Design an enzyme around this catalytic site. Sequence first.
Site, PDB file in Angstrom:
ATOM      1  N   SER A 134       0.554  -1.596  -3.707  1.00 10.09           N
ATOM      2  CA  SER A 134       0.380  -0.261  -3.157  1.00 10.09           C
ATOM      3  C   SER A 134      -0.873  -0.115  -2.312  1.00 10.09           C
ATOM      4  CB  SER A 134       0.371   0.746  -4.292  1.00 10.09           C
ATOM      5  OG  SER A 134       1.655   0.902  -4.875  1.00 10.09           O
ATOM      6  N   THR A 183      -0.618  -2.486  -8.039  1.00 11.39           N
ATOM      7  CA  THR A 183      -0.044  -3.319  -9.084  1.00 11.39           C
ATOM      8  C   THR A 183       1.254  -3.915  -8.563  1.00 11.39           C
ATOM      9  OG1 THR A 183      -0.917  -1.770 -10.714  1.00 11.39           O
ATOM     10  CG2 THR A 183       0.685  -3.423 -11.449  1.00 11.39           C
TER      11      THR A 183
END
EC number: 3.5.2.6
Length: 262
Positions: free
Chosen positions: A42, A210
Amino acid sequence: TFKTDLEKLEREKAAQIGVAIVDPQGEIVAGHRMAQRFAMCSTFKFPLAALVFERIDSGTERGDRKLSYGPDMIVEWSPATERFLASGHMTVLEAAQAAVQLSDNGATNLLLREIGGPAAMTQYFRKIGDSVSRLDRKEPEMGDNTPGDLRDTTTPIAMARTVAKVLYGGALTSTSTHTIERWLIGNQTGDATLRAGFPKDWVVGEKTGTCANGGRNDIGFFKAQERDYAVAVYTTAPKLSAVERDELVASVGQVITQLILS
């Protein structure tokens, strides 16, 4: 001792740690595995938001423009997109802030729909002088992080320099720069990662990532007194737990601090 502290973490936690720290002009301060490719996860949502502010700054986009969507746009981890679903829209700015500060995947994909998808994101990277970072897919598949896949990857040094171009090297107007800086400070997802291992009087703003297969990342900036830095940390720890992974990035935070305070 910076290198050897990171090597000890890498050895003890069965991890690889990519770091780059640059000054406002992108000049290298310190690095480890800084030109090894890692999945972005992200973290690309910060550059996406910068792409949007450039368009706002240019007039080809309007911050308060309403982006209508339906339930088809809800994907895994879309907390704001779900809340705004009934209303039928988020504005360009709402979506961008949620992408940055909540890592909202639907909001991110909503923005990609508008600017031309992954190819447009990669074109923006190139515009601001980053020939390395690449977005190839939307969420959530872009975080697949398949071992060895160069899709959807950056390098620590490349991303850190893009951070600096965005925050310090004039990519955005003073106003849009200030806004995106404050969004990073106010990120809701990074309390346990880098900023956890930075002194509490340093101004820190960052975006986490993540990925599957043990990817945990954090990129952004810090101000230690009157000294501004851009920082990118990508880590791969397949065998750590998620909390251990948070705490790995926090430790990199500490090692970074021990260096800067020297």
